[PDB]
Every structure is written in C-alpha cells, then in structure tokens.
Design a protein around this ligand. Structure first.
Ligand code: LMP
Ligand code: NA
Ligand code: NA
Ligand code: NA
Ligand code: NA
Ligand code: NA
Ligand code: NA
Ligand code: NA
Ligand code: NA
Ligand code: NA
Ligand code: NA
Ligand code: ZN
Ligand code: ZN
Length: 259
C-alpha cells in the first residue's frame, strides 16, 4: 500500500468508484454525460489511476473535471498527467492554484523545506468555499478545509442506487505536520485554519467518508467487510466526526509538545 501501488478499483456506492492506489485515494464520480475525478495520487500513480478508470468501464476522454484536495506530491503528483490524458479542467482552492501549476509548495506550508516537488498541471482554476461544480447530473460542493495547506478543499456529493441515496465526503487531510524548523505555536493563521476545518468537517452530512489517505477511515478493513456485508460497510455517519477528532488530537498533541 505504497503511494503509487496498484490497487484493483471498486465501486463504493452508486456512481462513486475508488480508482486510487493502494496508499492514496482517488475517486471517479461517473455519469453518462461524463465524469469527475477527485485527486491524482503520485506521478507514477497516475498510470494506476488511468488504468483503473478504464477497468471500471469508463473513457479517460469523458473525465471533465479533476478536483484537488490539496497540493502535495502524494495527492496531486499525478494530476498533471491525468489532466493531459483526459483534457479535464483542474479545480482547487484559491491558495493552492499556484502550487498545482508549478508543482512547488510555498513557504507558508508547514512542511516547506521537507516537501518534494511534483509535475505542474495545466488548466488549473480556483473554486470558493461552498461552490458547486456541475457536470450533467453531477453536483459536487467544495468546502474550504485549510490548515494542512492553505487551499485545501473537502468535496461532497450524493450518490444513489435505485433511488436510495447517501452523502459522500472526500475528506482532505486535516493533519498538523511540519518540517523540523517549524513551530505551529508561532503561526496563528495555520492553527486557526486547522481548527475551523475540524469544526467544518465534523458538521458535514457524512454517510460515507473517503479520506485522502484511505486508512484514515479504515478503507481496507471496510472493503474486507464489504465482501460479506455489501457496501453498507463503507457507511458510517460518524466518520467525518472521527476524522475531525483525530485532526484535533494531532494538533493538540503537537501544541503541547511545543510548550
Ligand atoms: C506526512 C503525511 C503524508 C505525506 C508524507 O508521508 O510525506 C506528506 C507529504 O504530507 N501525508 C499526510 C497527510 O495527512 O495528507 C501526512 S499524515 C497521513 C495520515 N496517515 C498516513 C501515515 O501515517 N502513513 C504511514 C501512510 C499519512
Ligand atoms: Na491498479
Ligand atoms: Na455507476
Ligand atoms: Na492505505
Ligand atoms: Na497538465
Ligand atoms: Na484544493
Ligand atoms: Na499551497
Ligand atoms: Na493553469
Ligand atoms: Na501540515
Ligand atoms: Na453500515
Ligand atoms: Na485527521
Ligand atoms: Zn499533504
Ligand atoms: Zn498526504
């Protein structure tokens, strides 16, 4: 379950399909009028993602949007390649747009000094908090969830099976991690951002959460359960509350260690 590892794709619920690697989530939200891809994994992982979308029966050329959670190599490293293979437009939080274009995270990132650059993407555009991304019958809402990066977005939609619908959340990372030289206690905008994001995420309507690092919401344990119990295994309307609580815990542990 390395970041670039192959992973057989699978449907989580309705038109929501996992197409990521063994280590990094990516989701295809499908329709007859074309598809939305959330995240690209790594540069090497783009070849996995692309094969996975085809394995689920879909054409790359029908992927119209690529939505970015945030602009680090593990989630975004494959976006450029995917953008070239699909022709899609890439959508991201305002403050991450320049990072996706260049593949270089800025000094405001707590991990600056320890991040690896990744390929820059074409066709990157900003979305605002609350904004809807529409494609045919698809409707995906952007929620600003800054802190791990300034432009982090958590994306939400509804998927249905014969009219039984669930609220699905692709949860951006909420983790306070840094370079050795970085003190969170000196950076109030990042701390405030993280706290506001924990609050936003724990309030989301959230039947199925797919975390950017899938194991954050126990994806693989859930998939193993689904073999027997079906896709109810992915459903847990407390999962966004749990991702938020873990984020909060990680930040409070860190602030205490900095005293
Ligand atoms: C530092 C991490 C990782 C990246 C990394 O491993 O370098 C970094 C670029 O940000 N990505 C991260 C993120 O939260 O998006 C964070 S924490 C994440 C949650 N549990 C994962 C883990 O512990 N693994 C060994 C896979 C990593
Ligand atoms: Na694969
Ligand atoms: Na489908
Ligand atoms: Na994993
Ligand atoms: Na590109
Ligand atoms: Na974003
Ligand atoms: Na950024
Ligand atoms: Na661009
Ligand atoms: Na961080
Ligand atoms: Na259930
Ligand atoms: Na978390
Ligand atoms: Zn990251
Ligand atoms: Zn990550």
């Amino acid at each position: 379950r390395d970041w670039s590892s192959p992973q057989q794709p699978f449907t989580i619920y309705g038109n929501t399909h996992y197409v990521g690697t063994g280590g990094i989530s990516a989701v295809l939200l499908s329709s007859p009028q074309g598809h939305i891809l959330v995240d690209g994994t790594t540069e090497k992982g783009a070849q996995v993602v692309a094969a996975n979308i085809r394995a689920m029966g879909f054409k790359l050329s029908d992927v119209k949007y690529i939505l970015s959670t945030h602009s680090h190599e593990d989630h975004a490293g494959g976006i450029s390649a995917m953008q070239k293979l699909t022709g899609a437009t890439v959508l991201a939080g305002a403050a991450n747009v320049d990072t996706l274009r260049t593949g270089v995270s800025p000094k405001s990132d707590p991990q600056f000094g320890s991040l690896s650059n990744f390929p820059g993407s074409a066709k990157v555009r900003a979305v605002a908090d609350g904004e809807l991304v529409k494609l045919g019958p698809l409707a995906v809402k952007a929620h600003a969830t800054p802190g791990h990066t300034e432009g982090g977005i958590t994306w939400t939609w509804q998927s249905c099976e014969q009219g039984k619908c669930k609220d699905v959340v692709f949860a951006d990372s909420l983790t306070a991690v840094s370079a050795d030289s970085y003190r969170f206690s000196d950076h109030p905008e990042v701390v405030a951002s993280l706290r506001g994001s924990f609050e936003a995420v724990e309030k989301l309507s959230c039947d199925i959460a797919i975390a950017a690092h899938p194991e954050v919401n126990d994806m693989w344990t859930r998939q193993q359960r689904a073999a027997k119990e079906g896709n109810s295994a992915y459903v847990d309307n407390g999962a966004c509350r749990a991702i938020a609580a873990a984020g909060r815990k990680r930040l409070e542990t860190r602030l205490a260690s900095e005293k």
